[PDB]
Design a protein around this nucleic acid. Sequence first.
DNA 1: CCCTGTTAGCACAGGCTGCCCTAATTTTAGTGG
DNA 2: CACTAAAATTAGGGCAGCCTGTGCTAACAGGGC
Lengths: 140, 140, 140, 140
Amino acid sequence: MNELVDTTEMYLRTIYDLEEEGVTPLRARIAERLDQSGPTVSQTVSRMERDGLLRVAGDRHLELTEKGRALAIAVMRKHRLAERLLVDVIGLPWEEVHAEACRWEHVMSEDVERRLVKVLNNPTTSPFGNPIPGLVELGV
Amino acid sequence: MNELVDTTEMYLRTIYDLEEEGVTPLRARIAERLDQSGPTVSQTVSRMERDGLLRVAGDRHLELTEKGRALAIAVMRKHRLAERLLVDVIGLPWEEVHAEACRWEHVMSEDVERRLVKVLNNPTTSPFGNPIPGLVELGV
Amino acid sequence: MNELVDTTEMYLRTIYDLEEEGVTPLRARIAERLDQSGPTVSQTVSRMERDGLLRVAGDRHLELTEKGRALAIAVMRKHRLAERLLVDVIGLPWEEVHAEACRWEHVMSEDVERRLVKVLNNPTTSPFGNPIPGLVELGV
Amino acid sequence: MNELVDTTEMYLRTIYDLEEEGVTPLRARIAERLDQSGPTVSQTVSRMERDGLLRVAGDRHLELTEKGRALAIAVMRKHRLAERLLVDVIGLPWEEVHAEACRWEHVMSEDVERRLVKVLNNPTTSPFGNPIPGLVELGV
DNA sequence: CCCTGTTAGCACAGGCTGCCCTAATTTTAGTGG
DNA sequence: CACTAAAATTAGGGCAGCCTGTGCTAACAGGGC
Ligand code: NA
Ligand code: NA
Ligand code: NA
Ligand code: NI
Ligand code: NI
Ligand code: NI
Ligand code: NI
Ligand code: NI
Ligand code: NI
Ligand code: NI
Ligand code: NI
Ligand code: NI
Ligand code: NI
Ligand code: NI
Ligand code: NI
């Protein structure tokens, strides 16, 4: 198992965080946040272009395709739903929830996601306050 | 990401499965169970033997080492606690919870397992009846 | 510096050697001979195919392009002239010449090569009996 | 292969050159002579500093460590024993021997160096008049 | 415009291990003669 | 021991995903001519 559990999904989520924070998505940002060498993130981002999940712009900005944005959103959704489960229900300490959720985001089915929306009483936010994306696309 | 999520863990737990059922743990069993080829299974098993996780015994059986066994128990434990959590709290359909728990077992920290035991009122079994191993060494 | 000094050239000359011994040139033979990993050679071989030096047949034979074989021949010429110089003139023990010539083949210019045909009295074989190829196309 | 063949050795030997010439060894000086960019030589210098090959003094003068000096001496010695060999034995036109010995210095074993000392009747200088350093260390 | 160097963000070459495959054998455990 | 069925190996790959080394341009900074 990868330390990232799913590399591709971690690249998508990271680009998405960047968009949330209002910083320009560059390969250099992904290498910083995931502690990887430039040649590593360059090659991996190429594989993701090949598979149509992102594209490198002329100015080197990373952009999510439609397939890549739909997936990124899905992962962010599971992440924050996992965060809620972990805090509201399990009571895992705060400073551990993101780290745990960062693994959970790559394995939770949408089947489970929909159950969690019901069980956690229709949560629109993570336990930190960040809005949960893609609830419509989940189907809620 | 790996279909198995964690190949090493799925190999250890699969060996746990065969021991629990009373069938001789052979590489040929892992090939059937995990649907992989013989060459693949021997190759991975070699890595795991190299890494101190198991031995290929003189008569070909796969004996888990002490490190291998602790991990195998830790993974089976997370699996059945995940199964309990999914049925009792999340309400995932029976048909599906094993498939789900087969992924969660690979990402759940012991920190969450300990908090699950309480959340689930000191469970001793999976919803399918099988006993939950390693509750002692989990520290409860 | 590379341990091979020149990876591409060593690959070419290795292919040359294999052909010369009458063994089918496969990536596996190169992996053995240069002690490199399988993915390393397949990747290097890919660059060489990108660059017009060879192609991988459908049955996985490595086929030198006309340009590829010209470079291959050119390197062995340098190798074997270097062996003549090192034995006939410099007097390096017989056991250590191939090792030295193996690094030399990669830095020798054609100008030097041509001066060595003169100085060594139109040589036509290695000290070990093997013919020096590429003399005609050298400028002889 | 690298155009310099061995970047580290060419950096060491270049520093050594400047010291013979009595010019202050600065990174700008290296950039100049090997025709590379400021950034490149700045990065390459720090790897070497890292590996204990040189010190960058408070005033920015590059300074060889005893380990860096020993390697620079050995490359200069190879460079000049090669020059000798190229003029006296091989007969390569004058205008071309420095370019040829600029590559050979990086591949010649000490085993060959000691044979060249014997065969060229104990040379002390290059055909350009510059003294060959490290003949003592070589083991003569 | 030099000069000397830095910081940021790339490029390509050439290395690695993990974990997956087919085809074609070979070894081994158990069975029957 | 001799055939067989199950088990494992041998041979030669595949792709994903890590790495360091060694090169680049742009922008900038501080001082100089
Ligand atoms: Na790194
Ligand atoms: Na290797
Ligand atoms: Na340049
Ligand atoms: Ni943009
Ligand atoms: Ni988070
Ligand atoms: Ni994650
Ligand atoms: Ni046994
Ligand atoms: Ni189960
Ligand atoms: Ni699993
Ligand atoms: Ni063929
Ligand atoms: Ni040879
Ligand atoms: Ni060579
Ligand atoms: Ni100084
Ligand atoms: Ni010179
Ligand atoms: Ni040089």
